[PDB]
């Protein structure tokens with residue numbers, strides 16, 4: 708009954724904060740500061756409905772240049788923590804701040820997870836409070852790069868205010884879970900997979 712989610716995207720967009728919003732607890736270190744905080748992948752979990760939500764937070768692996776002390780190692784850690792594959796890649800972006808570095812992050816997502824990764828990706832917009840409606844912003848946006856990203860993700864978008872509490876927090880998480888359910892329906896309940904994921908899964912069952 709696991710539902711596995713990997714938080715991906717540019718550094719500082721509110722990845723760790725989003726994981727915290729979803730799990731409704733302080734699972735991942737998140738705070739104000741100009742430098743990158745998350746330096747290693749982390750895993751946490753919680754229940755929602757009748758599924759165990761499993762979330763993998765990520766360091767700055769999606770930057771164009773290597774900004775990791777051990778990039779290859781952290782990618783491997785990400786794979787091992789999410790095996791046999793994520794149900795969702797949550798591509799975290801800050802609303803009104805989709806830059807070339809965000810475009811780079813999306814390319815790095817495809818490099819690390821495969822050219823088909825976008826098919827299991829949902830675009831999460833953080834800083835929702837900075838808005839009208841999310842749909843209205845999208846239509847009014849002349850950010851062509853962002854429109855391409857959203858189209859590549861089949862129009863699957865959701866907005867969070869990571870500082871949301873109580874009922875507001877609930878509603879936004881409900882919205883995300885609705886998005887996830889719709890994606891899972893489209894994919895016949897399957898998680899994302901690729902050759903490295905299947906290789907890990909086979910290795911784990913051991914020599915015969």
Ligand SMILES: Nc1nc2c(ncn2[C@@H]2O[C@H](COP(=O)(O)OP(=O)(O)OP(=O)(O)O)[C@@H](O)[C@H]2O)c(=O)[nH]1
Nearest residue numbers: 718719720721722723724737738739744745834869
């Ligand atoms: N107001 C507001 N602040 C946010 C939102 N999302 C994240 N933040 C803040 O932005 C700061 C950075 O958040 P993080 O959770 O560390 O973001 P991150 O993407 O994990 O950052 P790195 O691990 O450094 O790459 C924190 O102070 C958060 O409280 C949001 O939706 N609204």
Ligand SMILES: [Mg+2]
Nearest residue numbers: 722723744745
């Ligand atoms: Mg973080």
